Design a protein around this ligand. Structure first.
Ligand SMILES: [Mg+2]
Ligand SMILES: [Mg+2]
Ligand SMILES: [Mg+2]
Ligand SMILES: [Mg+2]
Ligand SMILES: [Mg+2]
Ligand SMILES: [Mg+2]
Ligand SMILES: [Mg+2]
Ligand SMILES: [Mg+2]
Ligand SMILES: [Mg+2]
Ligand SMILES: [Mg+2]
Ligand SMILES: [Mg+2]
Ligand SMILES: [Mg+2]
Ligand SMILES: [Mg+2]
Ligand SMILES: [Mg+2]
Ligand SMILES: [Mg+2]
Lengths: 129, 123, 146
RNA sequence: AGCUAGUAGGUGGGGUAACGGCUCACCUAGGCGACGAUCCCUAGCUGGUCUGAGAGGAUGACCAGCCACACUGGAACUGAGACACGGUCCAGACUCCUACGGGAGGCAGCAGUGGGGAAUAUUGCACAAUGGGCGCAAGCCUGAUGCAGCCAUGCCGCGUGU
RNA sequence: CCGCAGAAGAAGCACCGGCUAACUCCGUGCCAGCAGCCGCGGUAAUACGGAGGGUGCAAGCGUUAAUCGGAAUUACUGGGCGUAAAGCGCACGCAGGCGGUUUGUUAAGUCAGAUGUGAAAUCCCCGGGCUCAACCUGGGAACUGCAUCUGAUACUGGCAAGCUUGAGUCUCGUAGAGGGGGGUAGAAUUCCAGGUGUAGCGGUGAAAUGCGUAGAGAUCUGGAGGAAUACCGGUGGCGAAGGCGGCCCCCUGGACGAAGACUGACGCUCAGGUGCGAAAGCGUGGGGAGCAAACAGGAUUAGAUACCCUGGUAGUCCACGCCGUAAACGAUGUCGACUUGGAGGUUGUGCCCUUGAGGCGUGGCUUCCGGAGCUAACGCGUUAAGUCGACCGCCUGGGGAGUACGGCCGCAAGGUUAAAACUCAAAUGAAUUGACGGGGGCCCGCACAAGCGGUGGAGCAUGUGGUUUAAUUCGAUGCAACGCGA
RNA sequence: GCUUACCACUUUGUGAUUCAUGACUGGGGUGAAGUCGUAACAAGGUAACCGUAGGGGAACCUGCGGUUGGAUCACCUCCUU
RNA sequence: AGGAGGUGAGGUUUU
């Protein structure tokens, strides 16, 4: 049933953007908060806050530069049905450097440019633009 | 469409039959016409058409259309078939190379001499 | 019976008689068997009492491997004097066009069963003519392209 | 959709230039198979070539590496190196010669002929150069090779004029 | 290479209506003929044959043969499954695929660095020589591959520990045509027996077959037998689907609601496999009131094998098995999360001044409209055809064809898997206009209905068709031709 | 020289697969609309379609289960909208 | 628009 938390998080984010919701809440995890941090580094969202101890709840606030949503496209890449791994320099660059292809590497979670600067690679979580 | 389904049974390509199976990947075939006659055409082009049934060297008998106005073709004729189908004749998918050991070019024809066998006249 | 299915489906035959025709040895000896091509014989006015036209000679293997026998050869209809001028007048101002229908035999003569058929009108091409006009207009209106 | 019992392994002998059921005697009754075993059809493989921006699809023209083959099949010997492409033995077909007592042959080498096909070459010259094998060596030969002939079969260039 | 006379010795093919670069004439007249398609050619062909003239390549031009591309038309990059081809009829489940949250540890998948190697040849880049080129050649890169040594621990995974947030059990109830068996009540129909009772009954748009003075039909009494349960009963409920409908009892499954306690990922989806599976049909033994395949008789029609009528067997009913096919449909596979809403039906529950049936709501099933969004549109729209993830199945132009053969199952009828040869260049789906409907609604008509008088019956004249001749010149053919041209 | 075992080829008997042929027979496609009826597209004049059984010279017809991928709505009377 | 009040199909299939 619940086969991928990351895909569910991306779907909830996209649905909140479509519905113009200000904040979206979900269960939290280390990978989820890492993805939230890597998104907030590039400022695709306002801020993420995780509350609670027995049931850790993460709530992310969506940015709105105008009526149009700040994030237009977001697509899961490394799905449980097919894992994706690229080389050191063969990571994809979405929209020729406009947007981030979130990648979890040996050191940790980072973006495509950070991975290229650090000279390593990993799995491509999702494209965001 | 599922990746697991594709892995368990790879997506295969559909075979496509050749429009001239009797040629067997050969540019031309030689045979002798078992019969030479005329066949009634389809609805719109009621113009009479000339055909011959010829049994090739491969043991298959095929019907081939005859081009030009006036044909130098008969039975017991060593002919040459090149391929090509006419949508106006039902069940006809072959063409005869007029000018191959038992046929002359179109009489009194001065155009498309290469395509109709005739050599270029001196004058 | 050589019913001439074209002249049967279109413009039913109305008048006919029995007469032979003149031919050489090349285009003969196969009409005795029956093979022929007499579908919609275009018999027109000839000074020699409307010489047989239209129908060709049978493609039977009687060829000298040069031609069948005669790609175009004279074929003569038979009438003493009854239908030269009358046939011209009928074709001119009646609409009846005489065509050959069948090849009956007295066991010796291949009889020209010519039938005087009515000239039937063409199908209404008033749609395809406009389609062709629109096609040529489309081909011509491609000027403003650079 | 089941196959296999010399088949899976072990214990010892023999055999191989060396490992090994390669083989023998005994014992254990396993081994392989849904990742396709067994069986049927097809197929020389690769570097590469064509078509494609790419992933892909087709194929193995020329050349190079490897494999297998030498009328079909079986077997062995010599030789370090073969079950031998112009060594040997034998079964079968075919062909040829014979004095009718009896013998020879295998162009998938160069050419060339008969047949097939839509369709494809001269029965040339030379060891002149390289290479090959033999030999003190000069030197022998090489249809490898190089050159020559025909074909517009494909690529390129020039000319029929200003 | 130098001299030798003279341009003197050397151009063809295809096409010319759009795709595609190119226009005129002559002749034939759906004929002859061109073609890859669209499509030409029915007296005026830039399309056919020829001629003239233009265009595209050129010692080479066209046809044909094979691969890919355009074909995103097998799509992994890069398709779809409600109506075009496509969700198995439904459920269980193995191998298999994937998998909630946290910690430690392994280095397996993954990432980084280094080594060897990826024969040469060939593609490519920088250069060079053949009059430049074709061709040859030097150097370099590449050949994305493979194995090895050491690190990285974010993710997937191996191992060891945990958690409830998923998944199940227990407590208490709620609703339910959920399933099976055994009894039981009434209405109605048929039949039998009894009484009264006469010329008709039955039936159709109309008639007749059919029954009937032997006493029918009709009306009161009693009895026999089979099927289904009028109302409640409802876009109501239950069940995985099919399906389930008087009442009672027995055995029993499933769903939801209330928190609480417990195990703690035990989970999701499945090829093969297993079970259920409307109706019809088949076998065995009963039963049969009505209904009625097939069949018989009477109607209709030009004929009726059928819709009209009277009979009428199998079956419809029960018990055990076989068959496993349906428009088995929500034409929409199962599971998990998110996304505006408006009105509803039914159930549980807290809750409020229960002031009353009402008020604030909340959970389980279901109906309609509808926003964003999606779709070719119709339309889906919190029960998505929307946003995504996990898995299985299915589709690749139509007919042939879910057909033959082969395999398996079944007593049989048959069911499952499942093609090719051949043929066509379309097949199809949504939607618009018109037309049509022995479709509906509305309004009109010497049109219908109501009256009055005419033709076809008789004589004569005018025109036409048929015949005839030397012509019976010729033109027109329902309304809209026929004392018409005239 | 004799002989034993291993084959290879040949022969016999019995099987399996494939091809061609085969008197005859069944179904399909194309062409003519030639013959016959009108089953479907409208309420196609008996609404069809799907499953299944039976019948007919055939399109089809009838018996039982299911769907709207069908039509008027209400030729009158009511009362709710 | 909640429930039941009824017509009118033997009278034409082809092109
Ligand atoms: Mg040993
Ligand atoms: Mg081979
Ligand atoms: Mg030799
Ligand atoms: Mg491509
Ligand atoms: Mg492709
Ligand atoms: Mg598609
Ligand atoms: Mg469909
Ligand atoms: Mg379903
Ligand atoms: Mg089915
Ligand atoms: Mg009855
Ligand atoms: Mg279905
Ligand atoms: Mg809606
Ligand atoms: Mg097909
Ligand atoms: Mg079948
Ligand atoms: Mg009808």
């Amino acid at each position: 049933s619940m086969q991928d938390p990351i895909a569910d998080m991306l779907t909830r984010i996209r649905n909140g953007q479509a519905a113009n919701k200000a904040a979206v809440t979900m269960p939290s995890s280390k990978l989820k908060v890492a993805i939230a941090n890597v998104l907030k580094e590039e400022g695709f969202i306002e801020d993420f806050k995780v509350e609670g101890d027995t049931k850790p709840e993460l709530e992310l606030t969506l940015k709105y530069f105008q009526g149009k949503a700040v994030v237009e496209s977001i697509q899961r890449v490394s799905r449980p049905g097919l894992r994706i791994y690229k080389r050191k320099d063969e990571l994809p660059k979405v929209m020729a450097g406009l947007g981030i292809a979130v990648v979890s590497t040996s050191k940790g979670v980072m973006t495509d440019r950070a991975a290229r600067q650090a000279g390593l690679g990993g799995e491509i979580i999702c494209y965001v633009a | 469409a599922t990746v697991n389904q594709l892995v368990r049974k790879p997506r295969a390509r559909k075979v496509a039959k050749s429009n001239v199976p009797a040629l067997e990947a050969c540019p031309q075939k030689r045979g002798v016409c078992t019969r030479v006659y005329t066949t009634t055409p389809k609805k719109p082009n009621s113009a009479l058409r000339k055909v011959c049934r010829v049994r090739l060297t491969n043991g298959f008998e095929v019907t081939s259309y005859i081009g030009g106005e006036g044909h130098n073709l008969q039975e017991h004729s060593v002919i040459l078939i090149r391929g090509g189908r006419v949508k106006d004749l039902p069940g006809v998918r072959y063409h005869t190379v007029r000018g191959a050991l038992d046929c002359s070019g179109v009489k009194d024809r001065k155009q498309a001499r290469s395509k109709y066998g005739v050599k270029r006249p001196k004058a | 019976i050589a019913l001439n299915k074209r002249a049967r489906h279109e413009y039913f035959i109305e008048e006919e008689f029995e007469a032979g025709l003149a031919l050489q040895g090349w285009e003969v000896k196969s009409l005795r068997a029956g093979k022929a091509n007499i579908s919609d014989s275009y018999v027109l006015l000839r000074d020699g009492e409307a010489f047989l036209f239209g129908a060709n000679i049978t493609p039977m293997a009687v060829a000298s491997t040069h031609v069948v026998c005669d790609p175009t050869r004279t074929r003569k209809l038979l009438l003493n004097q009854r239908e030269l001028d009358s046939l011209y007048g009928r074709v001119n101002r009646e609409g009846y066009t005489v065509v050959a229908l069948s090849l009956y035999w007295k066991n010796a003569w291949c009889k020209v069963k010519i039938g005087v058929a009515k000239g039937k009108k063409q199908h209404d091409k008033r749609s395809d003519i406009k389609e062709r006009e629109w096609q040529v207009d489309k081909a011509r209106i491609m000027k403003n392209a650079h």
